[PDB]
Amino acid sequence: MIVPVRCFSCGKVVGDKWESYLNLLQEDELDEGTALSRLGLKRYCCRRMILTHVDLIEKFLRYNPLE
Amino acid sequence: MLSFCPSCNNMLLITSGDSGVYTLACRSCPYEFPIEGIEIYDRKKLPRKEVDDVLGGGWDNVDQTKTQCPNYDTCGGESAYFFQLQIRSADEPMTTFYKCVNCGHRWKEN
């Protein structure tokens, strides 16, 4: 849905890195691995937190009932 | 027999005529083939069905394995013909069956 605040295994804050990861991928495009490493996501648990996240909240917001 | 009429090609039958003559009379058509001292014979071969040897046993053509049967205190068997069947549920694994080659004792190690 929305990016989890913390890595499930580590407890490291990853909820402040989703947008920077997206802008690293889009603006001045980087590979996913180097984008993850540039954000400090060194451990593979924190890496998968961002790598495997499905941003479903954007799809959910298309059906906003309070327009 | 299995003979057919030349006229209507219906099956011919033997009919008892006068003086007990065994003619090849044709039902459904005026056809008569009589027997004047002629031997109408039908010969069909039959299988010989020869002798068969002792059944014995073809256990050399079975999959052995390296297992010691529970009856190792009676016979020193380290082999067992086996087949594996999953008589357990899909969540469970497979079950293996065994038969010691030294005594003929069967057991399933699951």
């Binding site: 495997t52 996240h53 499905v54 | 299995l2 209507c8 090609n9 219906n10 459904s28 999953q86 899909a90």
Partner: protein, 765 residues
């Protein structure tokens, strides 16, 4: 980098799925129904007359669903999600044009609504058809919903694909200590019957029909069908082979044992045994009754004085019996995939609407008789008030049949249940796998595992892993990823083609030479013989690859039973293969480059003869390569991509070829029960039960299938950091050790949503 044919021919699979989706059996069946089968039903039941008042008739001119002639736009349908919320039926109105005569010689048309048609989601008549996710957001629909189901009274019902044995085909079965019986369940457009065909004793062959009192000797029926030489009977059913002569000759003796026979004598014999016809047209009880007995003995209705077609059908029926007599293993496997047909939601609804419309017409004519039985002042103006009233029964029965799954068909007279099931909303994969699911025919004597085993003939047609557990193990089946279900093609355009290609009609052939050359069978019926069956089959396959005949028509040759078989009926499962010619594949990656660049969609691979559909039967005549590197100079086809032997649900498994098969089947079971994301409108939905994962993740190890079915868009699971080790002793026997503070951070965190529905009902007071 240049295209490599080996690792880039798999793009044919996304190309095929783009225009032929996973939920396409239901969609194509419903579209065909509402576009042509409605027309066929209206034209068959086109004129209801009255015994009184001959200068008066009612004519059904046209039938249309959800569209009138007043405007180019269609009628406004209540959107399917609004139907789901409001507990109503997503249905469109049925319109007909009526030619009802006026008392003053007035001819007029109309646009009359005779009920509501429950519309399949994402069909031609649906509002979600070709919606661009913005219209979908406006209509509160997930763009990733499969469609292919119905919303009846707010409930999503799916008409499951049905397995059955093929009709109008001979099936020979043996037995131990009973004898040999072989049947032909023959279904006409209005009467279904099984011309059962059994052996009783002494190797005597009998015909056992439901209408006939006692099983009739086969020679009697063969003579009754015009084949009356009694040497050509044995020539037709035994040919020149001495063994079959001896096996069959016993029931030649019983032909004359009663009395010798003309055609008409055996006719009268067979007609004596007709049971009854509800005591109407009693004055037909003569030798004339055998004519209807023979003409309604099978699907080969005879409408003239020539009985050679039915006679040869019974003759081949007998000949198959006699081969089974000489040896078993000449019987055919009843669980063979080629011997089964898949009936679809459109066919079900077509027959159900036929019955409902017949009832509607009968009751409308009853009302017409009641109105016009009055002597005077019989005004004609507005004779359609009653039809305005009586349109409710079509809608009511059509909704009730889908809602309950019970289908009471008076005309055909069976009561089948479980046709429809509530669509599974446990997960996205649960819904998708509920679609493309097939239910097999009941009354199967489940005590045995006969129709429970995996057959090799289902390779690439039915998923080899997606089978249920507990009780329906092997009975409920699932479609493989890349499959097609054939439609009905008219066989008279292609019988003419067979005659053009060298087939001699059975009316030009003598009995003595019939088993000398190959016979040619069209949908199970011996239509003629041919010299050079190999050349005939090659010419037919070339003519199909060039598009002169339908690509779903199958031709294959049988060596044991000297027969070239051509099948045009619908319900046959088939899949596309790359055609291998002269030891080379026909795609050669120029077509792959064009396909990837944008030209040459999948259909153009069929139009250029690079790919073709093969049903289970043509695979007997084929020799498929799994890969390019094993194309040997004797192979006819090449696998497009071999992982398509698994279905949609089994495609969730990573590296399934490295697992024991029961584990793959069990994951097919578990993935449908996994908690995850349901839809893009899942928070707009109000369902009876809905489990939702708070933080779903797409799998790190995915497959081509999960991205083909968009499972990575609505994933059900999470990538847990896992240490495989013995720990704490609380993990013995499948038990898992979960991390506190991973649960605290939201791992495995889900929620359940439950709806409760109450109606404030008005009362008669």
């Amino acid at each position: 980098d240049e295209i490599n044919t080996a690792q880039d021919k798999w793009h044919l699979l996304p190309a095929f799925l783009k225009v032929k989706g996973l939920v396409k059996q239901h969609l194509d069946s419903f579209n065909y129904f509402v576009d042509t089968d409605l027309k066929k039903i209206i034209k068959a039941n086109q004129l209801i007359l009255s015994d009184v008042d001959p200068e008066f008739y009612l004519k059904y001119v046209d039938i249309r669903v959800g569209k009138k002639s007043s405007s180019s736009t269609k009628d406004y349908l209540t959107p399917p999600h609004e139907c789901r919320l409001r507990d109503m039926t997503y249905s469109a109105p049925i319109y007909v044009d009526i030619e009802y005569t006026r008392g003053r010689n007035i001819i007029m048309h109309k646009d009359v609504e005779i009920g509501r048609m429950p519309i399949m989601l994402r069909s031609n008549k649906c509002i979600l058809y070709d919606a661009d996710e913005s219209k979908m957001a406006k209509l509160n629909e997930c763009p990733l919903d499969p469609g292919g189901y119905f919303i009846v009274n707010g409930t999503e019902k799916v008409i499951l694909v049905q397995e059955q044995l093929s009709k109008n085909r001979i099936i020979v079965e043996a037995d131990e200590k009973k004898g040999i019986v072989q049947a032909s369940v023959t279904s006409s457009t209005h009467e279904r019957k099984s011309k059962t065909y059994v052996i009783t004793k002494n190797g005597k062959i009998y015909l056992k029909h439901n209408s006939i009192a006692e099983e009739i000797p086969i020679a009697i029926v063969l003579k009754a069908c015009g084949i009356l030489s009694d040497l050509e009977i044995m020539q037709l059913v035994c040919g020149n082979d001495s063994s079959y002569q001896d096996i069959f000759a016993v029931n030649l003796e019983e032909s004359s044992k009663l009395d010798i026979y003309t055609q008409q004598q055996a006719l009268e014999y067979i007609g004596a045994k007709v049971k009854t016809m509800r005591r109407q047209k009693l004055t037909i009880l003569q030798e004339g009754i055998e004519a209807i007995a023979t003409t309604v003995i099978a699907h080969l209705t005879v409408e003239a004085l020539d009985f050679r077609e039915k006679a040869l059908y019974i003759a081949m029926m007998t000949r198959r019996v006699v081969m089974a007599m000489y040896n078993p293993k000449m019987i055919d496997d009843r669980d063979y995939v080629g011997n089964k047909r898949l009936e679809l939601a459109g066919q079900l609804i077509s027959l159900l609407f036929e019955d409902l419309f017949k009832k509607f017409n009968n009751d409308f004519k009853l009302s017409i008789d009641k109105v016009l039985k009055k002597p005077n002042r019989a005004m004609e103006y507005d004779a359609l008030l009653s039809i305005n009233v009586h349109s409710n029964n079509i809608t009511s029965g059509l909704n009730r049949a889908i809602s309950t799954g019970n289908w009471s068909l008076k005309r055909f007279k069976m009561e089948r249940a479980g046709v429809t099931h509530v669509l599974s909303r446990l997960s996205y994969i649960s819904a998708l796998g509920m679609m493309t699911r097939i239910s097999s025919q009941f009354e199967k004597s489940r005590k045995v595992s006969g129709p429970r085993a995996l057959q090799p003939s289902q390779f690439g047609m039915l998923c080899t892993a997606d089978t249920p557990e507990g009780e329906a193990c092997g009975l409920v089946k699932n479609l493989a990823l890349m499959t097609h279900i054939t439609t009905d093609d008219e066989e008279e355009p292609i019988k003419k083609l067979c005659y053009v290609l060298g087939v001699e009609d059975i009316t030009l052939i003598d009995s003595a030479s019939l088993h000398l050359n190959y016979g040619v069978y069209l949908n199970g019926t011996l239509i003629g013989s041919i010299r050079f069956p190999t050349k005939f089959v090659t010419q037919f396959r070339h003519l199909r690859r060039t598009g002169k005949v339908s690509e779903f028509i199958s031709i294959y040759s049988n060596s044991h039973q000297m027969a070239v078989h051509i099948a045009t009926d619908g319900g046959r499962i088939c899949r596309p293969l790359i055609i291998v010619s002269d030891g080379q594949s026909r795609v050669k990656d120029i077509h792959l480059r064009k396909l990837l660049d944008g030209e040459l969609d999948f259909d153009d691979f069929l139009k250029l003869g690079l790919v073709e559909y093969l049903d289970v039967n043509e695979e007997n005549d084929s020799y498929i390569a799994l890969y390019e590197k094993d194309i040997v100079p004797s192979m006819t086809h090449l696998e497009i991509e071999p992982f398509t032997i698994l279905g949609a649900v089994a495609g969730l498994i990573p590296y399934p070829h490295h697992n024991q098969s029961p584990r793959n089947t069990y994951q097919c079971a578990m993935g449908k029960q996994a908690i995850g994301a349901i839809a893009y409108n899942q928070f707009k939905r109000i369902d009876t039960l809905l489990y939702l994962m708070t933080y779903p993740q797409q799998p790190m190890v995915k497959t081509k299938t999960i991205e083909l079915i968009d499972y990575d868009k609505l994933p059900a699971g999470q990538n847990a950091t896992v240490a495989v080790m013995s720990y704490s002793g609380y993990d013995i026997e499948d038990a898992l050790v979960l991390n506190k503070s991973s649960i605290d951070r939201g791992f495995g965190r889900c929620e359940t949503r439950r709806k409760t529905t109450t109606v404030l009902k008005r009362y008669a007071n």
